[PDB]
A paper describes a structure:
The Mdm35 homologue in mammals is [name] ([name]; alias [name], [name]). [name] thus contributes to the maintenance of cardiolipin (CL) levels in the inner mitochondrial membrane of human cells, thereby sequestering cytochrome c and stalling apoptosis. Crystal structures of free [name] and the [name]-[name] complex reveal how [name]-like domains could be stabilised during mitochondrial import and the location of a buried phospholipid-binding site.
Crystals were obtained for the apo [name]-[name] complex with several diffracting to 3.6 Å, and the structure was solved by molecular replacement again using the [name] structure. Four copies of the [name]-[name] complex are present in the asymmetric unit, and Table1 summarises the statistics for the processing and refinement data. The [name]-binding region on [name] is delineated by the region between residues P13 and L39, which encompasses the edge β2 strand, an ordered proline-rich loop and the α1-helix (Fig2B). The cluster of three phenylalanine residues at the tip of the [name] coiled coil structure (F19, F23 and F28) interacts with a hydrophobic cluster delineated by M22, V38 and L49 on [name]. A second hydrophobic patch comprises V33, L34 and V36 from [name] together with F41, Y44, V48 and I52 from the other end of the hydrophobic strip on [name] (Fig2C, left). The first turn of the N-terminal helix (α1) is unwound in the structure of the complex and forms an extended region that interacts with the edge β2 strand of [name]. V4 in [name] becomes sandwiched in a conserved hydrophobic cluster delineated by L34 (β2), L54 (β3) and Y77 (β4) from [name]. Although this region is partially disordered in our crystal structure of [name]-[name] in the absence of phospholipid, the defined regions superpose better with the PITP-bound structure, which may indicate smaller conformation changes in the [name]-like domain upon lipid binding.
Residue numbers in the entry:
A (entry chain A): 1 to 395, 405 to 425
B (entry chain B): 1 to 40, 47 to 59, 66 to 114, 120 to 132, 141 to 167
Amino acid sequence: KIEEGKLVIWINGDKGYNGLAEVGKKFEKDTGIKVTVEHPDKLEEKFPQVAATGDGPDIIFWAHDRFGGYAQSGLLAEITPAAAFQDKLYPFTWDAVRYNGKLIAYPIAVEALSLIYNKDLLPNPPKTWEEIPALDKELKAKGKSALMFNLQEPYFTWPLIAADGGYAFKYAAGKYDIKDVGVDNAGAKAGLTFLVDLIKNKHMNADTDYSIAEAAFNKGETAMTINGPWAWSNIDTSAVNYGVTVLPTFKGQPSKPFVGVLSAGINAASPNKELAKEFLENYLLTDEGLEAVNKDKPLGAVALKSYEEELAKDPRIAATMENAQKGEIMPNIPQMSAFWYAVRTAVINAASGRQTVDAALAAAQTNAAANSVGEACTDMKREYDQCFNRWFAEKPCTDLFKRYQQCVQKAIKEKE
Amino acid sequence: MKIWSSEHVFGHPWDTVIQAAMRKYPNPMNPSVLGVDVLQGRLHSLRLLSTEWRAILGTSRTLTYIREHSVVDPVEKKMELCSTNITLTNLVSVNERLVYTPEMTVLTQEAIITVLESLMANTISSNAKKGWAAIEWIIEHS
Ligand SMILES: OC[C@H]1O[C@H](O[C@H]2[C@H](O)[C@@H](O)[C@@H](O)O[C@@H]2CO)[C@H](O)[C@@H](O)[C@@H]1O
């Protein structure tokens, strides 16, 4: 069970978790209440697993897109800031963490991907994707490359896929149409085809991941990368002279990154709900609290107005906002879970050449099927189902199943 | 009370047809689903399918949930799957048997509907036709 009289916070490993732990120390100093900040592997998948059993952290940080799934499965407490407190944050950020008329988290910061470039290698970064082949060709002559970014997370390629018309779910009159997935259209195909052609013409490697792309940029090997505010910090400690700018246009259209609000949810099973509210409202969502995290790894454009006014002076933040404005706020509907993998597989398969673009995206449009009764359970399912089938090469997977079953059994509580 | 029987013959091995049989989320069929209880001398498996299917729609604004019970236990090639409608009014029961008949494979199904009813009957037969097609579909893409 969750421990009473103490706070345990989970946040993704790419964020300022050391800075958050400083805020935690401040909380502990004032109140005697210990605050422990951890960054578990696959935390977006772990949280639903543990929370389904009433276990896990008191507070969880993730982008808002996963929160509707978690709320629908009853893993998150409704939160209740006073009118006073709500006025301290931008309205639109609250809207991101509203689900079914209820607030399910505190908004922290607005995240968007930007184009990051090395000014000494590339004083004028390219304005279009279409220039990048020719740029790369020239840079390979010097033993460098034009661009490297994380291909293993569809987050990072999505801006290109969406630029000419790829989408996730249709939106009309305040409602997302889940029966329609826009991941198989001509715009989505064009975008992915461009990426696949970059790989076919040797301008990119199909297995480039976050750390490879990070190491390549910060060691001066590649002239550009694509990443969020959190990454600026490690470039700062390298000797690279970097600019952060608007993503390249594609077919004359802006890249359309998916915009996340980093959000902090309270575990519905936590016995420390008031302490969590104290910590989030009076310690983290303050100029000094956000500064401490931001100093560890930049948050992006923060939800807190008082501090955003200061951050907005930074041209990296203005770039972040220009990209966010050209992009689209992620839905927080429970189906996002299935969408995200559905694309994760398609991109990897098209990039590696296991599937053609057309067949990979065609398969994704189906695999985006919502995929579970339990809103937050879709990954535990995909992990399990994937095994049971492999087992049907026998006719083992029990370890996944116990986990899968709990999550969906908890949702089955409020139905028949 | 409307009844349906049909058998369809599958130009595919029993094994592959049963493997496909286990997969939903085909382009022909919308409904979401998951495996709630499974145990194995034999194999049993228990699922819940939410199936989505305008006065009638008003009557069921809320999504309708389907329960499947299926066993594949005998070394002799076999599956049985049983579907019920979770609501307050009238039932449907569909049972499929998949075994291969002269290895191609063939199923024999029933739909039993209780409470118009003609629409319900027409719909559940159409779903069964779609289903054969989805299994045919799933082979290609598995
Ligand atoms: O790639 C799919 C992934 O996209 C988004 O995740 C971002 C996340 O918003 C950031 O916190 C950052 O760490 O990078 C992630 C990609 O690795 C969605 O939040 C997430 O739900 C989705 O899985």
